[PDB]
Design a binder for these strands. Structure first.
Lengths: 14, 106, 93, 79, 98, 98, 84, 107, 93
DNA sequence: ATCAATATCCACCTGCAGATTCTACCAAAAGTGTATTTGGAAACTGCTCCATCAAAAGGCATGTTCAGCGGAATTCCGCTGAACATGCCTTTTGATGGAGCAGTTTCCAAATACACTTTTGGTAGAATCTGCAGGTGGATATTGAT
DNA sequence: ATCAATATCCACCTGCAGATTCTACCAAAAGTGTATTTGGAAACTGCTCCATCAAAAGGCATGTTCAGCGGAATTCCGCTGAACATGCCTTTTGATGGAGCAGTTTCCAAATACACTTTTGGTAGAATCTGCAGGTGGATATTGAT
C-alpha cells in the first residue's frame, strides 16, 4: 500500500 | 538484486535521486536516507497532481491528461497553487473568471 | 541520452487513474515539475547544512526543507510519506 | 516596425483572456512597450547563456534558464 | 439588423478565451520581434523553434496576468476600462517600475 | 486661539518621519507580540535581543513599503485617504493575495 | 509568567500613523489600524514560523538573529545589519 | 612571499575568497582565476557604494558614514537600487518623497 | 573566530574618501552587502557551470555571472576590474 | 409578453496525428562485496547572554471635543471606444540545401593532493581619542486669520 | 497684503557612547613547492533541424455609427485631523542567577572509495493503435427589438 493523498485516496498496489 | 525503491516501497528511482544529489554539489556527503526521503516526497507530490489533473480530465469528459488539466488542477487547489505560484505551465490556460462588476444587468 | 522522470510519472499515473492517459506535452510539464521541486528541496537542504556547519545532507535536512517549502496540508502528507519510505527502507535487509 | 506587428486584435485577445471588458485606445501602444521591455530582459539573459556556451543558436533551455532567474519559471520546455 | 449592445461580445470573448489555451499573438510577427530584439545583443543568431515557442508562452502568460491586475486597478477606481495608468500602477506595485 | 488647517501637521509629519530612521513601534510592546506569536508556534523559546531587533527592522520596512503602495492605490482612486480596500488591492497585485 | 494575549494591540494607533507617515500617507481611514495589525500579524507569523523552523533544526531553544535573517531571505525580504 | 591579492593588484583577499568558493560547494573544482576575478568585482562594488555613501555623509555635514548614508546612496542610484531592490538596510529610513496631489493649493 | 571583510572595506573606504569614517552598524551593513553579492555571483556561477556540464568555476563563469546579475553600467565596470585583475595576477610569475 | 436573429449545445461520426506496444542492442547505471576513513553525536563544562525583577520619570498613548473638508452619491453630457461589414495582404503550411549543435579522440595546461614554513586577521583588554546627539537660543520662515 | 502665531533652520556648545589605538598571543590562514590526476579545449564530422523559398490559408485594417461610460459639477453628511488634558507604561540603568549555546576530546556508525557484476532505462526504426478534434445537424437558449 503506497501513499495517502489529501483526498483520502491512496496508491494502494505496490 | 533488489532495488532501493523496492525496499522503500516507492515507484520513484531512489538510486537516481541519490545520484543527482551528489552530482548536484549540494553537500560534501549524502546520507543514505536522504534520497529515499526525497524520492518519496517527489513521488507523493506527483501523485497529488496527477490525481487532481486526472479529475479535471474526466470533468471535461477526456481520458487523456493535457496541460490544461494540469493548470486547472494546480490553480483550483489553494496549496498546489501556492507551491507553484511563480511557475508557468506552458499551454495551460487560465481559470474561467469574470469580475462580477462586469456582467449583465437585471 | 536524456533521462527524465517520465516512466515513473507514468507508473504513478496508473496508480491513481488506471484508465487515464497523458499527452507528451503534459508529460514534459510533469518532468519540469519534478526537476523543479527536486531543485528547491535539494537547495534548501543544502543551505540548512551549510548554516549549521554540516558536511552531510541526510533525511533530516530533506525533511526540514519540506516543512519550509511545502504549503500546509501538502507538507503534512509529504513528511509522513518520507518518514515512511525511510523506515520501510530501513526495516529490511 | 516589427513591434507594431503585434496587432490590436492580438492585444485585445490577450486582454480578454485576463478578464478585460473595455479597452482604452491608448492601451495598445502602452502594451507593446511593456511587451518589448519584457522580451529585452529575457532574451538578453538567454543570449548571455548562449554566448557563454560558445553557440550561435539560442536554445529552449537558454530561455527556460533566463526565465527562471527572471523569476518567471516555465514548465514544458525542459526540466 | 440584429446588433449586440456594447460589451455583449467582449463578454462573449472573455468567456471564449478563458476556456481555450492557444497563443493569441500571431507566431511570425512575434518571431520577427524576438529576433529583431536579440539582434541587438548578438549579431547573426539562430533560435530553436522551441526557444521561440517558450519565449512566446512566457510572454503571453505574462501579459495576460498583467491585464488581470490592470483590470483590478481600473475597477479599483470605479471604472470598467483598463487604461495606461492602470497598467502603470500595476507594474509599479509589482516592483517592475519604481 | 491658533489652529492649523487639517493636513498641515500631517504634511509636517511625513517630512519629519521621512527624515529619520528610528523605529516607530514601541520596543517592549513589539517584543511581546513576537514572543506571543512565537510562543503559539513552539513553547519555551528564547530570543537574542538582536533577533527581536531584526524582526522589528524587517517588519517596519515592510509595513512602510506597503503603505506607499497603498497610498498610490488611494490616489489612483482619486482619494488622499488610504482605506483597507487600498491595502488589499496592493497586496493582491504584490502577490501576497492574488 | 504570565500569559501572553492580545499583544497585537501593542501596535498602537500612534505607532501605525507614524509608519504611514514615513510611507508618505497624508490621510488615514478609521478602519486602517485594524487591517494593519492583521497584516502585520501575518507577516510576523510567516517570518517567525520560518525562523523557529531553523532553530529547531539546529536543536536550540534560542531563536538567533541568524535564524531570523535566514528566515527573511527565504521570504525574499533580505536583511542587512544582523550578520546576514 | 606575496599575497595572491598583491599579485592581482587587489585590496580584497583573494585567498579568503578562493577559500569560501570551495567551502561553499558551487562546483567540484575552482580555477585560480575565479577568486581573483570575484574578489575584484566585490572590491569594485564596495568602492562604488562607499564613494556614494561618503558623499551622502558629506552632504549631511557628517564625517562618519552610517546606515542612512548607505540607504541614501543606494536608493538614489538607479543601478545600485536595482541590485539591492529586495534588500532592506536596517536603520536606513526612506528617501524624502511626497506625492504631489498631497501638497497644498493650486496657482 | 568570526571572520569579516571589515578591514578590506576599511582600506577601500580610505582610498575613495581618505577622511571619512564608518560606524559599526554601517560596517555591518557593508559586511552583509559583500557576503550577499558574494553568494549571488557564486550561485549564478554554480548554475552556469552545471547547465554546461562543467565541474570547475573559472574566471569565465564568474564573469558571465557578473553580467547576468549586475545592472548595465556596474557590470561593464565590474567586468573591466575583473579582467584586469586576473590578467595582472597571471603575468605575476 | 412577442418574434427572430443568433449563439450555444449536444449527440453522433471518423480520420490520423499522436500515443502505444514491440523487438532489441547497450552504455550507463544501480546494486553488491571489501577496505578505509571521518563526520558528527556523546559527555563534560567554560562562560556568553538571556530572562527578570527593581525603580523612577517623562515620553507618549488615550480619550475627548469640535468642525473643516474629503468622500461619495447624483445628475449629466460630450465623446470614445464597441460592433459590424467590406476588402486583401500578411501569416500559415509544407518541401529542401546546409549551417551548426553535438559525439568522439586527443593530450596538455591546470587542478588537485600533501608537506611544511610563514604571515596575518581576530581578539582580549587596558586606554586615550573624538564625532556628534541633543540642549540652547535666536534669526528666518511658513501658516492661517483678516 | 499686513499680522501674529509657531514651526524651521542654524550655528554654537559639550558630555559621552562609540570608535580608534596599541600590545600580545596564534591558530588558522595563506603561501611555497614536488607529485599525480585530469577536465575540457581543440580539431574533425555526421546528423539534425533551422532558415528560406513558395503557394494555400483566413484574419487583420478601414470607416460608419451611436450606446454607454468617464469625468466634471454639485452637494451634504459625517468622518477624521488638530489641540488638549490626564496619567500610564515604556524606556533606562543595573545587578543577578543560571539556562543554554559553544569549545574540546573521544570514537564508532556511516559514508566515501573502488572493484565487479547485473539490470535497466533510453534510443529506435517499425508496426499498430486510439482519443478526440473538427464537422454536420437539429434542438433550444440568449439577446435584443418592439
Amino acid at each position: 500500500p503506497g501513499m495517502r493523498l489529501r483526498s483520502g485516496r491512496s496508491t494502494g498496489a505496490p | 538484486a533488489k532495488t532501493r525503491s523496492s525496499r522503500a516501497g516507492l515507484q520513484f528511482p531512489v538510486g537516481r535521486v541519490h545520484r543527482l544529489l551528489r552530482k548536484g554539489n549540494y553537500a560534501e556527503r549524502v546520507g543514505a536516507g536522504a534520497p529515499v526521503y526525497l524520492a518519496a516526497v517527489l513521488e507523493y507530490l506527483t501523485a497529488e497532481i496527477l490525481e487532481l489533473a486526472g479529475n479535471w480530465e474526466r470533468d471535461n469528459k477526456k481520458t487523456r491528461i493535457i496541460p490544461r488539466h494540469l493548470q486547472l488542477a494546480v490553480r483550483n487547489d489553494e496549496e498546489l497553487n501556492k507551491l507553484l505560484g511563480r511557475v508557468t505551465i506552458a499551454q495551460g490556460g487560465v481559470l474561467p473568471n469574470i469580475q462580477s462588476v462586469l456582467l449583465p444587468k437585471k | 541520452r536524456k533521462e527524465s522522470y517520465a516512466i515513473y510519472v507514468y507508473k504513478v499515473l496508473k496508480q491513481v487513474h488506471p484508465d487515464t492517459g497523458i499527452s507528451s506535452k503534459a508529460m514534459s510539464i510533469m518532468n519540469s515539475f519534478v526537476n523543479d521541486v527536486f531543485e528547491r528541496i535539494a537547495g534548501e537542504a543544502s543551505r540548512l547544512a551549510h548554516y549549521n556547519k554540516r558536511s552531510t545532507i541526510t533525511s533530516r535536512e530533506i525533511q526540514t526543507a519540506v516543512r519550509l517549502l511545502l504549503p500546509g496540508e501538502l507538507a503534512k502528507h509529504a513528511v509522513s510519506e518520507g518518514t515512511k519510505a525511510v523506515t520501510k527502507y530501513t526495516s529490511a535487509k | 516596425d516589427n513591434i507594431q506587428g503585434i496587432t490590436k486584435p492580438a492585444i485585445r485577445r490577450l486582454a480578454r483572456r485576463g478578464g478585460v471588458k473595455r479597452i482604452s485606445g491608448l492601451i495598445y501602444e502602452e502594451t507593446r512597450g511593456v511587451l518589448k521591455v519584457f522580451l529585452e530582459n529575457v532574451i538578453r539573459d538567454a543570449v548571455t547563456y548562449t554566448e557563454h556556451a560558445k553557440r550561435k543558436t539560442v536554445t529552449a533551455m537558454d530561455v527556460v534558464y533566463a526565465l527562471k532567474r527572471q523569476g518567471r519559471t516555465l514548465y514544458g520546455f525542459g526540466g | 439588423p440584429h446588433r449586440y449592445r456594447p460589451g455583449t461580445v467582449a463578454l462573449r470573448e472573455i468567456r471564449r478565451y478563458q476556456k481555450s489555451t492557444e497563443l493569441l499573438i500571431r507566431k511570425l510577427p512575434f518571431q520577427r520581434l524576438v529576433r529583431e530584439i536579440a539582434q541587438d545583443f548578438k549579431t547573426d543568431l539562430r533560435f530553436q523553434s522551441s526557444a521561440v515557442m517558450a519565449l512566446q508562452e512566457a510572454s503571453e502568460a505574462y501579459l495576460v496576468a498583467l491585464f488581470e491586475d490592470t483590470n483590478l486597478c481600473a475597477i479599483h477606481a470605479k471604472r470598467v476600462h483598463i487604461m495606461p495608468k492602470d497598467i502603470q500602477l500595476a507594474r509599479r506595485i509589482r516592483g517592475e517600475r519604481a
